[PDB]
Amino acid sequence: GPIPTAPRENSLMFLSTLPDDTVPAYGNVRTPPVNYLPGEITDLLQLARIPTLMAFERVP
Amino acid sequence: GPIPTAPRENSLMFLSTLPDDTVPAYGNVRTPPVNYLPGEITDLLQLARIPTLMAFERVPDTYVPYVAVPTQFDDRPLISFPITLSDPVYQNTLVGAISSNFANYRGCIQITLTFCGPMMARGKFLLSYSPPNGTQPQTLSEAMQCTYSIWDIGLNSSWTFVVPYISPSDYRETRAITNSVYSADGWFSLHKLTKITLPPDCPQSPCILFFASAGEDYTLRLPVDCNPSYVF
Amino acid sequence: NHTNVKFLFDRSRLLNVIKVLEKDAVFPRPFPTQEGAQQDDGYFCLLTPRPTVASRPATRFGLYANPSGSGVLANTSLDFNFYSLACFTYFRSDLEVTVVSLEPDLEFAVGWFPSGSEYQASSFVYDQLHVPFHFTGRTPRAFASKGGKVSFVLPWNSVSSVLPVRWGGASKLSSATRGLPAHADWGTIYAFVPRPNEKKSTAVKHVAVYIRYKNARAWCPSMLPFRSYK
Amino acid sequence: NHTNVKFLFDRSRLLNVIKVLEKDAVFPRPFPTQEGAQQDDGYFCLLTPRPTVASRPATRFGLYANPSGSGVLANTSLDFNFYSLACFTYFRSDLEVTVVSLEPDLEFAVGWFPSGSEYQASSFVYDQLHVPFHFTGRTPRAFASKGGKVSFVLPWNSVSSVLPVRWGGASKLSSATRGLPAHADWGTIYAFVPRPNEKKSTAVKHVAVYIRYKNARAWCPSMLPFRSYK
Amino acid sequence: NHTNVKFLFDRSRLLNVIKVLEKDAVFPRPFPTQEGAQQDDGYFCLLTPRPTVASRPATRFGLYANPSGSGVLANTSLDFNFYSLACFTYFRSDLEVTVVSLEPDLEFAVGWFPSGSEYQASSFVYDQLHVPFHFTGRTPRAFASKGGKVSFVLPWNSVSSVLPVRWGGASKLSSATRGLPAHADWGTIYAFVPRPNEKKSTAVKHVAVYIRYKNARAWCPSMLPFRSYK
Amino acid sequence: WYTGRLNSWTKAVKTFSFQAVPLPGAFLSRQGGLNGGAFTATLHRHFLMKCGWQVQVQCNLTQFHQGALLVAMVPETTLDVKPDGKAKSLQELNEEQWVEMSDDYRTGKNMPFQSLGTYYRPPNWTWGPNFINPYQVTVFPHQILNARTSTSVDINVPYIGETPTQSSETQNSWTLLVMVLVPLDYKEGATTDPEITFSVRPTSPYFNGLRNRYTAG
């Protein structure tokens, strides 16, 4: 049947953190495999765990 | 296939009470559990059931939540009022306050009384209800024809009273812009049945208090927006 | 199947035309009313097929066939189509409301409350700007873009079991007029512009109203209006 | 079922009206504040039912019933409806925000950040055009066409387990005012125009704010405000 | 889960502001460049988080803190947020582009090409009307109504396996500057108006750019920028 | 079990007048001549606490006495401070002897607040969220005190709070108050102006942290 047009409350808007995707532009692409690179990172906790050195202003 | 665009009749509108949800903004959140807090609330009926104390303007700006039995005697009731939630007497009770935020109510009204006086004094009291008529009844004789009950001073100290729900409809107007059958439901009164006993050297002028609460079948309907006058 | 009451009473018809609010304003006061009051007229309308005068229930219908005179004129209305349609002592149904502008390229919102309540008056002041409180409340407020179109369905909202087409009782013991019902309505409707009162404009705006009955039922057939032999 | 707290606290109500940003601007500074500062007011608003003054938490509510005087006026707000509605020592729910323009045919965007953060100041210069940094950041920025309408739902964002309706403790060991909470809010909201500061205009713009509670819960009943016998 | 790189690098941020094309125009030429050339600037922008100058790759970042002087100024940019966010020697992800106008009620279209290509120059003449060839081509061209909004996702388009955050090699045997990468970009973007050059107008138009990373990955952690103790 | 002495009832006391004991804050000042001796100091060497309470009251009237007193546990109250923002002194307690009703308390008007400063205009304060509703006090856990049958007070309130635990020196979520329902009256000769005594017991406490004795800021 015809479009049972149900207008949306606040469409025609731009939102920064909209999770959904958008229309592809230049699909059907192939990429060079990158499995040869070691040292993959998952979360910042990996770097947060490694210790480092603090400092203090030189005593007068 | 392509969007079979079916335009909607009145889209691009903003509506106050639209039930559906909207787009999430900052999802993937975690919250601290709150199970440790007791005293959860489900519906306003929980607060509406708990009784409270009414009040009356001081007999000739200080309202009083108590009444003292006088030594003088007259056939007229000592204290009476219409059963209408808009009256000042309910204007601070929890039930009255909650009802003020609704279009209509439904159910019975529960009333409680308490005595506070001497040791070796006794007496009798009569409780009555009168549906609406030409004018409020005045004489205990006229009141006696209506529904009434006997409350003895000495048997107990709080002879609970409940006004039955009577009306020619399914509900009644919470507020009365103009007097109407569905709005007012007559009055309620108390009568001194016999002279009380004054024992040796005891103080005089005992004290009596009254409490109101919503009946088990009490129910409201049709929420509304509040009057913001109390800010002033 | 055309004869079915449901298949008949399911179409929209015009009801009345009203102006657009620009301030808190005072609500009309009951009759008889003396002069000098600040109550304004032509802004609030009650949802009822039965005759009404000055946004209040009425018994006798009138019309201003004589334009000249002195005093304040009044609004009136009656659902010609509904009354001529058929005969039914009793009736009940959900009332559907719709509004469309009558001015060039206008935007606004609409406000409603059910029976038994009354207009909320007074206004606040924000950063030296005065706004009536009727903007916000417990009841729905609707918003539409320019051009404008408003639609929604209201549920039954009156204490009485049904709506009496031709009633003959009385409502109160003293001074009550015989035959005048009490709450045969779905409430009151009003329109306003989301602008501060400080920016009021002289030009008046006007808007029409359309209603539609959904899921109608009837009882106790009756008579139909007479037509002359002139 | 009308008595259910959830069925009651699920409707939109107006909160406050604010102007539209046109530059980086300085954020208000805590109290007491001395004169000569460049902090500007009436651009930032905090999301909180409890009373607030000059976009900051407060304890006592005030109103400018006396217009005349000297100095800088301040903003205030309090959810009349929520406070009058019921009694609950504790409360928690997701806060839904919505905004609509109050000027003819305007377009803009809105910006928000949660509690604990603060406004980002300073501005860049592109090809001799100055733009505040608040345009871009880690947090959402919303865009709407002319006319305007903004809607979304924010999740709970405060460290405290619930929101205290009437609290009586203190927040810090020294100088802390008794009873003044710390983070009973959902953050701060602000509006701005996607134009360079170089093209600022004198005419002011104003915008209203509406909020709605979703999935409300309560604990520990309480009392209700008093009303006079005058 | 907030610490996840994917959950972090999935939000839009501003990149740069550019003017609107009105003619074929000459593309910028490599450095050093002598005076008298017709190459125009501020119309083409390259998609790259790393620092760039005059729409070309660069190594050292600069800023025009001193306004006065003589000569031609240049554009610059760097993703402050991305660089401050975290440490990763290598990175790859699809780049999402979005554009919004910065002028009142404007309509236009956008044009793009990937890396390795270059702007197509020259123009045709139809019935005494001159139109640049860049209107039509092998690559996408997007069209939007007045007001304007453009969105789409570009796939990875560079020969290199990943994007190096801090590279230290060289690209060519002779004269190549150490550490300057070759094709760490997603191409170039540009905007234009679908009108003949014969109807050019003096008033300039400006437009902003927003980008977003999708499906990000990283390798070989690194250090973070220093902050002063001043 | 800590015990304390309050001021003595007199017929001069009006109605709706009151006095309150904010626990555990009153301990710091040893309100009503009360010295726990162990918990009082143990709080100082710790910072975070989580415990319940259990209270009691007493007032001896006689055959020829009449009156009515209201006692209840009202949480999150802030009535134990002067309008400026300072707690009252022992001299002030001995002077007032009772808290009399006022429109300020009815409206929450004069509760402590921060002065705006020289930058702002002076706002007109009208209302606050810590108002007092004299009539609806009965909603919270409470009991009556009638001269004919007033024996004693008893209550046991579970723990409450915006968080599972709070700082001792600042936390205040429970408070005991007494209200004069009916003004006291009696025939001369029997007990005149009976005294009021209060007892307090915490339950299931959990003291947290460790440090030297707390030092004033």
Numbering used by the authors:
A (entry chain B): 1 to 60
B (entry chain B): 1 to 60, 67 to 238
C (entry chain A), D (entry chain A), E (entry chain A): 29 to 258
F (entry chain C): 63 to 279
What do the study authors state?
Seneca Valley virus (SVV) is an oncolytic picornavirus that selectively targets cancer cells by recognizing Tumor endothelial marker 8 (TEM8) as the host receptor. SVV has a typical picornavirus capsid with four capsid proteins; VP1, VP2, and VP3 are characterized by a single jelly roll fold, where eight beta-strands form a barrel-like structure that is distributed at the exterior of the virus, while VP4 is located on the interior of the capsid. The structural architecture consists of four capsid proteins forming a protomer, 5 protomers forming a pentamer, and 12 pentamers assembling into a pseudo T=3 capsid, approximately ~32 nm in diameter. We used cryo-electron microscopy to investigate SVV under acidic conditions and in complex with TEM8 at physiological pH, identifying multiple uncoating intermediates.
